[PDB]
Amino acid sequence: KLPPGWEKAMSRSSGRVYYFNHITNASQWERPSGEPARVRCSHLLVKHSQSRRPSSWRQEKITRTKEEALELINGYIQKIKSGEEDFESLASQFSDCSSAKARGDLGAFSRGQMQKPFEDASFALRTGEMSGPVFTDSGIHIILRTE
Ligand SMILES: Nc1cccc2ncccc12
Numbered sequence: 001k002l003p004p005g006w007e008k009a010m011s012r013s014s015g016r017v018y019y020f021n022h023i024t025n026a027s028q029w030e031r032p033s034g035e036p037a038r039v040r041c042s043h044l045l046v047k048h049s050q051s052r053r054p055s056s057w058r059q060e061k062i063t064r065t066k067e068e069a070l071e072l073i074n075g076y077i078q079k080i081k082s083g084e085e086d087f088e089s090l091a092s093q094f095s096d097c098s099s100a101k102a103r104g105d106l107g108a109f110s111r112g113q114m115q116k117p118f119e120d121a122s123f124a125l126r127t128g129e130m131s132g133p134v135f136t137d138s139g140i141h142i143i144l145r146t147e
């Protein structure tokens, strides 16, 4: 019935059904539509004080809490979904990964190369789809599958 990792849920505020993916943390109103050797993704990383390396090109010492980083991620997702901002623009300005300089593009990769929650979300995304918040040892990611 539902593509890999999708479940039905019910909105607390409106009562209408929606769909949630427990691998990508994506959520949407419409019923989801429905593996390759390699996928290509971009990402926006927000680091926090418990990141493996709590430092980035934006900040020599990253001090924000994980909960604060999640709030920032959620705000970026809202602006991307409304069209107020583009993913690529937010990645270049605010991603704590050096890949910010390439609008978040990481290039193409296979299974076994990236951290596992990132890998699993990337491969479960369909081409053009965006994840919700994905947690790794690096921080919290928004992932966009481009190929
Ligand atoms: N909602 C949350 C997000 C991220 C970290 C947290 N830590 C403690 C309690 C709640 C949290």
Ligand SMILES: Nc1cccc2ncccc12
Binding pocket: 097, 098, 099, 100, 101, 102, 105, 106, 107
């Ligand atoms: N750290 C990085 C990882 C993957 C791709 C990148 N592209 C440009 C700059 C930094 C990158």
